[PDB]
């Protein structure tokens, strides 16, 4: 006997159900008659002992992901009507199905990121996996939601970086992104992951006064100790520690003439910004004060941002 080829190339999609004809690229399988088919992975198939058409067996599940290499070598026999034996070979590529989902494991990320970091700073890398080959196995990364144009992901490498935005903790303290990884090809399977981005703090904000301009009339009969006004500030960083100081006291008499040496006339509480009369008052002596107070967050990592602008103006008018 003589098979029409020495070696027949052949294909089969993984998961093909029982009875599926094997696809023969240089077939049909013919000998010029009985037939059988031998080999180690012969038991995934049955051959017809007359036609020599070959098919998947019953109760057999052909997984490409379980054969590496994903190719099969078998032997074909042909019995002569009186006992001679011709033979040929059968190569069989097992073709790939997209039967494996992009998997994130862990399926969830949480990472910290210091603020004021520059454009294109790399934040982290997500990696999904996929047990298929070619188109079916490859992965387009995408952020489906949560980024707010402050974050971007490399479609190929999964690496997430900052966009063309300043990332200020005091603007927004965290992000929760939803990232997709998708297969290419005719069956676009995807998997999703959560990325949670926590902005760590730099003490980079200015304390600012909430009540900056102030004009208060007080009686000359006010004694040292009397509380007159209260300046108040906030600093939007974590763990600020503010101090209030006075640095101007500009004193004018009844008709606009200045009066030397009155840094003592009032005092502010370093911790509360409560301001009190300190040395005694008299309209006839001084009828107006121009007190200027600043405040300084003492924990500030940037001196440039560590002090109120504007300062607070308290003008005090004395009555009879
Ligand atoms: Ca499979
Ligand atoms: Ca597959
Ligand atoms: Ca896949
Ligand atoms: Ca900031
Ligand atoms: Ca800050
Ligand atoms: Ca600060």
UniProtKB/Swiss-Prot annotation:
Location(s) in or outside the cell: Cell membrane
Which tissues is this protein detected in according to the database? In adult animals relatively high levels of expression are found in testis, skeletal muscle, heart, eye and thymus, and lower expression in kidney, lung and brain. Found in the sensory hair cells of the inner ear.
Consequence of mutating residue 60 to V? Answer: In strain: CAST/Ei
Q: Which residues form a coiled coil?
A: none
In this protein, the residues bearing a glycan are 49, 85, 164, 203, 230, 298
Q: Where is the Cadherin domain?
A: 4-104, 105-209, 210-320
**What clinical condition does the entry mention?**
Defects in Cdh23 are the cause of waltzer (v) phenotype. Waltzer mice are characterized by deafness and vestibular dysfunction due to degeneration of the neuroepithelium within the inner ear.
Explain the purpose of this protein: Cadherins are calcium-dependent cell adhesion proteins. They preferentially interact with themselves in a homophilic manner in connecting cells. CDH23 is required for establishing and/or maintaining the proper organization of the stereocilia bundle of hair cells in the cochlea and the vestibule during late embryonic/early postnatal development. It is part of the functional network formed by USH1C, USH1G, CDH23 and MYO7A that mediates mechanotransduction in cochlear hair cells. Required for normal hearing.
Q: How does it assemble?
A: Interacts with USH1C and USH1G. antiparallel heterodimer with PCDH15. Isoform C1: Interacts with CAMSAP3; leading to inhibit CAMSAP3 ability to induce microtubule bundle formation.
Per the record, the domain comment is:
Three calcium ions are usually bound at the interface of each cadherin domain and rigidify the connections, imparting a strong curvature to the full-length ectodomain.
The protein depicted here goes by the name Cadherin-23
Q: Supply the source organism for this entry.
A: Mus musculus
Q: Which residues of the full protein are shown?
A: 1957 to 2285 of 3354
């Amino acid at each position: 006997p003589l098979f029409t080829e020495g070696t027949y190339q052949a294909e089969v999609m993984e998961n093909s159900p029982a009875g599926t004809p094997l696809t023969v690229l240089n077939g049909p399988i013919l000998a010029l008659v009985t037939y059988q088919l031998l080999g180690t992975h012969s038991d995934l198939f049955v051959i017809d002992n007359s036609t020599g058409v070959v098919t998947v067996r019953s109760g057999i599940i052909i997984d490409r992901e379980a054969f590496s290499p994903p190719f099969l070598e078998l032997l074909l026999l042909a019995e002569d009507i009186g006992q001679l034996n011709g033979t040929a070979h059968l190569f069989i590529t097992i073709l790939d199905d997209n039967d494996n989902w992009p998997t994130f494991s862990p399926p969830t990320y949480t990472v910290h990121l210091l603020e004021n970091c520059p454009p294109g700073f790399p934040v982290l890398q997500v990696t999904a996996t996929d047990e298929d080959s070619g188109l079916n196995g490859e992965l387009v990364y995408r952020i489906e939601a949560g980024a707010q144009d402050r974050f971007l992901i490399h479609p190929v490498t999964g690496v997430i970086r900052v966009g063309n935005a300043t990332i200020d903790r005091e603007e927004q303290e965290s992000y929760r992104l939803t990232v997709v990884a998708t297969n290419r090809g005719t069956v676009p399977l995807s998997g999703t992951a959560i990325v949670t981005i926590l902005i760590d703090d730099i003490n980079d904000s200015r304390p600012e006064f909430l009540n900056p301009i102030q004009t208060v009339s007080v009686l000359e009969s006010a004694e040292p100790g009397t509380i007159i006004a209260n300046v108040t500030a906030i600093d939007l960083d974590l763990n600020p520690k503010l101090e209030y100081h006075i640095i101007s006291i500009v004193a004018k008499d009844d008709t606009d003439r200045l009066v030397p040496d009155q840094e003592d006339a009032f005092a502010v509480n370093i911790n509360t910004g409560s301001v009190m009369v300190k040395s005694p008052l008299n309209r006839e002596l001084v009828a107006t004060y121009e007190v200027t107070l600043s405040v300084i967050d003492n924990a500030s990592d940037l001196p440039e941002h560590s002090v109120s602008v504007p300062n607070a103006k308290l003008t005090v008018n004395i009555l009879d």
